[PDB]
Amino acid sequence: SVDQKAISTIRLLAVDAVAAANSGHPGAPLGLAPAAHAVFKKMRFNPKDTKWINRDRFVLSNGHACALLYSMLVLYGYDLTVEDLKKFRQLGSKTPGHPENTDVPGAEVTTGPLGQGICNGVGIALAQAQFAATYNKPDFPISDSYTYVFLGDGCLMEGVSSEASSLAGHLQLGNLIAFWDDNKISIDGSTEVAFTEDVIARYKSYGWHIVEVSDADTDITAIAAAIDEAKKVTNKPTLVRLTTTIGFGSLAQGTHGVHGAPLKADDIKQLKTKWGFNPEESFAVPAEVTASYNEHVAENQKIQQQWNELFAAYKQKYPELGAELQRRLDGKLPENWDKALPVYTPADAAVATRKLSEIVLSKIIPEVPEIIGGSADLTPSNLTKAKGTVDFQPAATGLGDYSGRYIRYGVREHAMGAIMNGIAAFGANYKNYGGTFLNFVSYAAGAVRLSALSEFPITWVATHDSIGLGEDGPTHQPIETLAHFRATPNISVWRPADGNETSAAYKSAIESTHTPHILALTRQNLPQLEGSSIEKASKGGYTLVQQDKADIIIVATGSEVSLAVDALKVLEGQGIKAGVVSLPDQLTFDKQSEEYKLSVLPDGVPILSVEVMSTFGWSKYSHQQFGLNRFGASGKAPEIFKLFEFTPEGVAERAAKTVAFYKGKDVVSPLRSAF
Amino acid sequence: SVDQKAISTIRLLAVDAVAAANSGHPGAPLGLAPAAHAVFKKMRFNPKDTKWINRDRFVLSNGHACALLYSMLVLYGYDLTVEDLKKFRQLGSKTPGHPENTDVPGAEVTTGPLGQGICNGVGIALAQAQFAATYNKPDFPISDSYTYVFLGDGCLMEGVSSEASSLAGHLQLGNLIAFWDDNKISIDGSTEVAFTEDVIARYKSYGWHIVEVSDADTDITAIAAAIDEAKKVTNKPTLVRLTTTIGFGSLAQGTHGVHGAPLKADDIKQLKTKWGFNPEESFAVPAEVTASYNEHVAENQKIQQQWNELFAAYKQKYPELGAELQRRLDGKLPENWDKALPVYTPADAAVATRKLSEIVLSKIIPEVPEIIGGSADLTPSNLTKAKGTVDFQPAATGLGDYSGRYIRYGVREHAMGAIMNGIAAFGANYKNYGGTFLNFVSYAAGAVRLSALSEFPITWVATHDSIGLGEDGPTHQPIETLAHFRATPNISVWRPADGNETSAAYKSAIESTHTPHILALTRQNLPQLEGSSIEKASKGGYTLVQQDKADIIIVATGSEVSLAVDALKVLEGQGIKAGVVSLPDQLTFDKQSEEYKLSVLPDGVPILSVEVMSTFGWSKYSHQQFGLNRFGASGKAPEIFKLFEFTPEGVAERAAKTVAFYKGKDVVSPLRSAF
Ligand SMILES: [Ca+2]
Ligand SMILES: [Ca+2]
């Protein structure tokens, strides 16, 4: 049949791509080709409009199997060709060794690191439910799409997938349909060596529906029927167990050796012969397969055309909601939304930046409907929903509704990070956030790094940023955390000092389209600074206190800016004139013009950094660094600051030493370099 | 009864400690006091010998409940007093807000970050099984101890606990007994908001045994019986469901408000009144409770005395095993074990450092019985057991034995990290390791940080360290990873360049007693260097190529040392004389004398760093830094190096620019500072 020919075509494209690279993973593509064929036949998508908001989404969580994804995209006429397949895993190609959403048309997310894609799928499905609840009306099914995820044994061992699966079951996400490649093989060999749990029993315990397909090597009718069954279960995510043979058809089928290395040339020849292909030919695409796939694309394009007309009729009946939806699909925030950002003066009271952040959210959430977010491993007293909103929950629970805006992630930081990526990936201008303690953003490093690589505008609301949290002690107090994330490409790491800086941090986070944000916020109260503003803080770094005859400039962030200002007064008494620079986001500052940056950190003056965390990175901006490069302590916060000499007198002493160290030396800006 | 009085005493000590601090968590201590009393009565331990190797171990994984742990330790006469309790959460006290194994007698591990303690318990139990299989003989039960773990709802949501629980069930760890505080409350409020899974069904799916105690607020008889039942099930870890009231006895019992904030003073008064205590008195310890607890301590001390005699008789019957066990309990490695480390010369072939590491392990494992380890999310071709050993598995599986030395962790990096901490915590000189790709050590950051804080000599064997891995691409290629871990206090991060440096890295890792190690190893082949040795590399940084008239020194690590040596030859052709420094471990180097360090990085010469990763940290050792501060690429590794100009010519160009930049400038060592 043409279906059988299509499956062979998929298999052989994947095998041939791996062969050309002499690198990559042919086993899972061979095993999953029947399922991929069956699922893509059920999916609604337009290869010529990858951003259609009512498309079904597909996520290949076992991302090493991506020769499979690329083969599907090529066969369906996405902006990816057989010539691109021939360049699989080759420098600069459109077919990298793991799929990248920035580089690959039809790759919704960046997968490869195990466990991530299934969580991303949870987030896409969460967003779809929230979006549909927000926009759908009687006779106007604006959003009714499904989220299809392929996953492997490795994904099921990673804790992040357990977290997301528990939460997805709780959230009754009936438009999520996941497929487990039950092939009994991982990298180390048999799953009998380390993975003997009853996976199906576990998924039932989370509240998922199960369908089992006992012969997924051939039974595409049963795979299609499993999809139909899953669609009837509207209040549970579904796991479809696909019992497959890894490397199906290969001489080495059913072995670990086919998981992650190219097949032997003679093996590829017999594959081709047994499936009716020419063993002397590579990258064959039978025209009958193309025709069959083009028929499904044509049908999907007519569905999209009808959706466009539905949307036009929606705008006529619901003008305000229609305009809102149009604006979001255009990628634009509401006009002048930022007028809602709170502004402070030095006459206002001291406030913790965690509380300032709460206040910002309270003001902007009602004005910007595409903001949703939540928290994990965090008291409601440290972050909760904006007044006038409700939690995102299935209505059946009585605890919220899918129209809700605040997600109760539970104690699941890593999955929260990966789910945020999926919400961003959904599109429709979603600007989503996740709260936890800064120190436990580290639990989610796998996902955070992927936010950066994937260019997703997600936001971490990361409170209790330092020893300033006090009594919980060194297990909770960040030291290395900002250095870690600042060292990662494409992460804005805001550490605002006061009310105006906190508003600038949110302006950046919400306006972002390609850069994830981490907002490092305090437990303890900080003063409103003389010289701060949203305008100046928006530059990432700025001159807070200008001193034309400066003996030294102190550059600081967050809680240490006020400390620097107090140190300036001590230094004046010692006959030393200091300027102060506030550097709320190093990435934003780095992106400013060279002349702007040099106006902030000029030549001819020693510069001392102060931040109660690792000194790593700080030499970009300073000659000497006062930081904390040891673990913290359990006690009242002001006593810990005194212990480590983060006091006005301690800063002044180090500033005076810095001035002395550079007497008679020529000093140029830390921004200067040799290359 | 005295048992009831003891439980009230525990409860009130915990409440009073939280009250004195005006900080901390009284709810779980109130709920878990009956269970803590019952479990400690069943445990064998000596408060006067916290390191008795056959003690039962207790782990409080819900570490925020530590007022409870401290109360138990005080009541049993550990080196912790009521005066220490009065200083709970106070700077410099022996009673920090979360328990720290370095600071607190009877704290086996450092808990607080959720999910970790249960995994640590898995590791303690794994080590006990391996230890018993190694040493026990007929009539000589050298090791027969249990591992008791308390955990909460938050712990059960964290993915790391799922990973460890799946693995513990697979490993049939029948001496592990965990207790779930089933109190329906987390920080956000009811578990109904985010945690509605069937926990018991999930634990059955992992192969655990279950006991349910429906009234754990009062039924200590049933808690004791649950322990007895668990001990009869020798081939499954057991989860005991303790249905408790959070804050039991408080006016606010059964609410989120009692989870993490001090009780009201009037509430504490009525607690005391209803339990027969004086509401005007704090930190009361009834003498009858002390007597009862002292009786159990006396009995346990007689058990230890009998164990000491058993050990003496074991040494008579089994002299060689006895001497080995004695050596390990003394914390000493075999005499001259390091003579087994491989040594190379520049005449030897190029080898990848991953392969050099395999070879080291192959040579040292047979000589050092306290080395065990494994791998997670890694092909057996990248790391497997040492020849002549077997996997650690229950014999019932036919796949290994508990005497085995190689652990199949599955795709569970985070749990592997936390389990390694538990193996180290067991003691007996265990020197344990875990293999994965360097980029996915980040999945385990929560545990890695705790290795550092806890001072555990664990080792990560972290291969595929850079863009040198090639085709898997930017999702797999570390950029930020070494900066992250180098910025963390107390982590040795070895990046060996060649065979001799790899042997030095292992010498450091295995000799370690207080510092975790990460070994960053290459996929690609590297040459044996002229000038390397185990002796010199043991200093962390050393002069590889000395040049008395140097125009520049190039400092490099790992794969970039050979690159620097090739660049020296290009520079000679341009009339520039360079020295080379190899810096295989920054921490070890930092610990050397100031004079040694200055001999390596002298004044009066520009210094350029080269490492194909983040430049963060490198200004400690250099004036200019050539690194990679963007994500990688998917292609053949040598082509990626060429793209980013990590070539002899690219290094030489930057070196020449550095020389030019410092012409006419006075240059001092990067090791100099103002303070
Ligand atoms: Ca598999
Ligand atoms: Ca609880």
From Swiss-Prot, chains A, B:
Any one of the GO BP annotations: pentose-phosphate shunt
Cofactor-binding details, from the entry: Binds 1 Mg(2+) ion per subunit. Can also utilize other divalent metal cations, such as Ca(2+), Mn(2+) and Co(2+).
Catalysed reactions, as listed in the record: D-sedoheptulose 7-phosphate + D-glyceraldehyde 3-phosphate = aldehydo-D-ribose 5-phosphate + D-xylulose 5-phosphate
Keyword Protein transport recorded: no
Positions of Mg(2+) binding: D153, N183, I185
SUPFAM superfamilies: Thiamin diphosphate-binding fold (THDP-binding), TK C-terminal domain-like
Protein's UniProt keywords contain Calcium: yes
GO cellular component, one term: nucleus
Keywords: Calcium, Magnesium, Metal-binding, Thiamine pyrophosphate, Transferase
InterPro entries: THDP-binding (IPR029061), Transketo_C/PFOR_II (IPR009014), Transketolase-like_C_2 (IPR055152), Transketolase-like_Pyr-bd (IPR005475), Transketolase_bac-like (IPR005478), Transketolase_BS (IPR020826), Transketolase_CS (IPR049557), Transketolase_fam (IPR033247)
Cofactors demanded by this protein: Mg(2+); Ca(2+); Mn(2+); Co(2+)
Binding site for thiamine diphosphate: H64, G112, P113, L114, G154, N183, H259, E413, F440
Protein EC: 2.2.1.1
Binding residues annotated for substrate, in chain numbering: H25, H259, R354, S381, H464, D472, R523
Residues at the catalytic site: E413 (proton donor)
GO molecular function: metal ion binding; transketolase activity
Site, as annotated: Important for catalytic activity: H25, H259
Function recorded in the entry: Catalyzes the transfer of a two-carbon ketol group from a ketose donor to an aldose acceptor, via a covalent intermediate with the cofactor thiamine pyrophosphate.
Family per record: Belongs to the transketolase family.
Subunit structure, interactors included: Homodimer.
Name of the protein: Transketolase
Taxonomic lineage: Eukaryota, Fungi, Dikarya, Ascomycota, Saccharomycotina
